[PDB]
């Protein structure tokens, strides 16, 4: 089992650069609109606590340099939506895929196309942590790179990159400019909530183990959702939601193991440890494979 | 620090479907030629001991059905190169990138674009193991998927997929159709030679751990190159050459840790273990990052 990204070509065709003064970041060109982080308009001395409304009043369409490679796209309008700038340009992107903007939940995974100066550098799979950070790999100049899923040729954009916390994890917004978690776009040290283990993904991993014949950990007990959630919190595990139970449905049907029966199996693992026995060849439970990732790889 | 693949768009525009009779697998369309595994011509009976040149002489151009998306491309010729079939078509691929065919060395990495029915499914990073297998993720119908590196808009193709061993690892060929390793395109259960760990890559990765602010495994000791190699061979690690030491130089300079000092740290980890501690989130020593991979990501 491995972390697999989606093929990135449909997103590569949409990356451009956006420059104000000497500040260049990545933007996303869809139809005739370019989306990018609003702090492209910030000077170094306004970053501590910028006045974005006041900074944007001073800007005009002709202050924005938008380039696809070396080709300039003329800007004919601009607006701000939360923490993203929307630049209307005079050309509709001929490589625009079928697409949606979506806001994901903690535990969901997505692919990140890491870009520098509008040019793709690499692709990898990330999971949104319960404290709304991602464990990414981003350098200076990566802001504006996006994360996405692809379903039947439709790209669902879910992440745009804005910042690196002092602990080395990353934070950003959806494509409507709303941050995931309690962060703000200022040059300031911010801290995330203490992280927790993604319970729904650990259960998906147990299902994958069963599918491959590794099932020693199954037991004859069951539990209520509420009883399991109260126990999980004592072990720094996320509580399960109704949506979590539902996305485990296909794996539950495939193995014949009820979701609440698998919860009682995980609950025994939590109170007693693994006893040096492994699951799928590991002493550690994996929590960054979603139920969809598991059926993707089968 | 994550396992990072190359962006796959330049390869996506080359993937097609090839069908013969009831068999379907993926092909690579470059200019006017489609490359695919030759056993697309095999029927089920043929699989065990196919005489390929004999089976190929009995095929006509019109037996090959090549599809790019919804469009069919007409085969105007065909030839075989080792385990790869080369189908000449009447249309040139306009999305053909600049490219080259290369044979990689054990321990080098590449990106794999997994495809089914000519459609890209996922992309991830693999290393050519010392025993010439790869620990990939491939299901039925993945044959013909390719592995590649990218350098300044030039795509270097190095792997085409052919089989899964009983142990679950994978085997394939370069784009001239020669297998990596002692494998053969027969429907038989085949075993690989005993694998070993890629030592220069483990060292590159420990350096990455330092760059990302993790130092719990460093120590005050030092070792000679030969004495490290004796312990490494004991633990089934490949020997470390002076070429590898030089290669790690940029990394050593960056962190101020001499190569043989980092070797002393790896020696202790091999002799004492990790004691349930973690490195970059892993409980095991990672060996599928090359020194180039580390430099490219960290800077
Ligand atoms: C004293 O303040 C700190 C204390 C402790 C940790 C800290 N982290 C950050 C922080 O992240 N700032 C944001 C920017 C702010 C405005 C969101 C930022 O630099 N984003 C980067 C990606 C970063 C860089 C390293 N790899 C990460 O992913 C990015 O690309 C952008 N660059 C610029 C350059 C100019 C103008 C806009 C942008 S946006 C500040 C900070
Ligand atoms: C008693 O035989 C075994 C015993 C123990 C383990 C074994 N493994 C294999 C084995 O791998 N065979 C090759 C095929 C051989 C000819 C190279 C094969 O199936 N390749 C797959 C990719 C495979 C499938 C599962 N995931 C992997 O990646 C592929 O796509 C192709 N399918 C066909 C189907 C028909 C015709 C051509 C192709 S080519 C056989 C075998």
Numbering used by the authors:
A (entry chain A): 3 to 300
B (entry chain B): 3 to 301
Task: Provide excerpts from the study.
The main protease (Mpro), also called 3CLpro (3C-like protease), represents an attractive antiviral drug target. Mpro is able to cleave pp1a and pp1ab at 11 sites, catalyzing the formation of a series of non-structural proteins critical for virus replication and transcription. In fact, a variety of studies previously demonstrated that only the dimeric form of Mpro exhibits enzymatic activity. Here, we showed that a peptidomimetic compound with benzothiazolyl ketone as warhead, YH-53, is an effective inhibitor of SARS-CoV-2, SARS-CoV, and MERS-CoV Mpros.
In order to figure out the inhibitory mechanisms of YH-53, we first determined the crystal structure of SARS-CoV-2 Mpro in complex with YH-53 at 1.93 Å resolution using the cocrystallization method. Specifically, YH-53 exhibits an extended conformation in the active site, which is located in the cleft between domains I and II of SARS-CoV-2 Mpro. The benzothiazole group of YH-53 is well accommodated in the S1′ pocket of SARS-CoV-2 Mpro. As clearly indicated by the electron density map, the carbonyl carbon of the benzothiazole group in YH-53 forms a C-S covalent bond with the sulfur atom (2.14 Å C-S bond length) of catalytic residue Cys145 in SARS-CoV-2 Mpro. This nucleophilic addition reaction results in the conversion of the carbonyl to a carbinol hydroxyl, which forms hydrogen-bonding interactions with the backbone NH of Cys145 and a water molecule for stabilization. YH-53 contains a pyrrolidine-2-one group at the P1 position which matches the S1 pocket well. The carbonyl of the pyrrolidine-2-one group forms a hydrogen-bonding interaction with the NƐ2 atom of His163, while the nitrogen atom forms additional hydrogen-bonding interactions with the carboxy groups of Glu166 and Phe140. Moreover, the side chain carbonyl of Gln189 forms a hydrogen-bond interaction with the main chain amide group at the P2 subsite, which creates a more closed conformation in the SARS-CoV-2 Mpro-YH-53 complex. YH-53 presents a 4-methoxy-indole group at the P3 position, which occupies the S4 pocket of SARS-CoV-2 Mpro. Therefore, YH-53 occupies the active site of SARS-CoV-2 Mpro by covalently binding to Cys145 and noncovalently interacting with several conserved residues, including His41, Phe140, Gly143, Cys145, His163, His164, and Glu166.
